[PDB]
């Protein structure tokens, strides 16, 4: 029955909150059920207010705990994470497992989008593959999660007015219906719409521009204004770029970047932020600093 598993899943969440990894067998079971839930979700996930929107966390588990202390614990607080859950952090395994665990337990209360690091290629360079091998002794867990990443929605739309995605706009995307037409159940391509949605950046330069990252495109203010008007959007909520103050308005408040990993890579010393969307869809921002690390001056 579902009741027995629900209690089992609850135990996992408590265990994961303590920063204790699940076993390989448990992870496999969790991923399987996650896919069944994610496969039903659209490329543009319809999200209801009120919700709290978060940027990258990059395996900084103890700052994810800080995030919940500031914004409130799931399921009481609705959450919308815009990707980049792994790599560049000592606790990517615990970070991704907890967020996947919460999604399975509270599908309606938490939304997790795909970021550019939710990729087989990227995870093998920036540490998530190494961490899984180190913490389990074999690559199976990495295989499971990377397969799961293929099902994560690319974008979310909040009350039909605020459009949330990791990277940014694309020359190949003019209407949200174009996004709904994409096939996302694949490894992140190096080119095209699904690549741009995860890799693009806003820019001061006008119009489209060459991305210094080697992927995606940079887009100016005129692009954002055209896209918002064409789709009836009030705001593009965005991730994927470090900002020192935690959040950064740009393009005449057509776009806002949110970064939720404080003291990024344990060296940037930046502030983290999360955007709380009221019951009235009115937006608010909470800035927070890294959690005091126990036994680490």
């Amino acid at each position: 029955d579902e009741k027995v598993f629900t209690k089992e899943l609850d135990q996992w969440i408590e265990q994961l909150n303590e920063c204790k990894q699940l076993s390989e067998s448990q992870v496999k079971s969790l991923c399987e059920k996650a896919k069944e839930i994610l496969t039903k979700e659209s490329n543009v996930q319809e999200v209801r207010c009120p919700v709290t929107v978060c940027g990258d966390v990059h395996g900084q588990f103890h700052d994810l705990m800080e995030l919940f202390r500031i914004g409130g614990k799931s399921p009481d607080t609705n959450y919308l994470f815009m990707g980049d859950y792994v790599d560049r952090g000592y606790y990517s395994v615990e970070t991704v497992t907890l967020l996947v665990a919460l999604k399975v337990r509270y599908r309606e209360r938490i939304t997790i989008l795909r970021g550019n690091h939710e990729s087989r290629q990227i995870t093998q360079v920036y540490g998530f593959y190494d961490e899984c091998l180190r913490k389990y002794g074999n690559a199976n867990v990495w295989k499971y999660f990377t397969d799961l990443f293929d099902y994560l929605p690319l974008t979310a739309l909040v009350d039909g007015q605020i459009f949330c995605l990791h990277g940014g706009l694309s020359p190949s995307i003019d209407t949200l219906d174009h996004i709904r037409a994409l096939d996302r159940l694949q490894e992140v391509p190096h080119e095209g719409p699904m690549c741009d949605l995860l890799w693009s950046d806003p820019d001061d330069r006008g119009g489209w521009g060459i991305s210094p990252r080697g992927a995606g495109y940079t887009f100016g203010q005129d692009i954002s204004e055209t896209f918002n008007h064409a789709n009836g959007l009030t705001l593009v909520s965005r991730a994927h770029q470090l900002v020192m103050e935690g959040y950064n308005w740009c393009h005449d408040r057509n776009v806002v970047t949110i970064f939720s990993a404080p003291n990024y890579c344990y060296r940037c010393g930046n502030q983290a932020a999360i955007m709380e969307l009221d019951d009235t869809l009115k937006y608010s921002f909470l800035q927070f600093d890294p959690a005091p690390r126990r036994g680490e001056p």
Binding site: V125, R213, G214, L242
Partner: peptide
């Protein structure tokens, strides 16, 4: 020293260049 963002952007391009 080196700018924080530029450090990550350059290596991201290298990975994407390697493809």
């Amino acid at each position: 020293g080196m700018d924080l963002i530029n450090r990550e952007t350059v290596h991201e391009r290298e990975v994407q260049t390697a493809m």
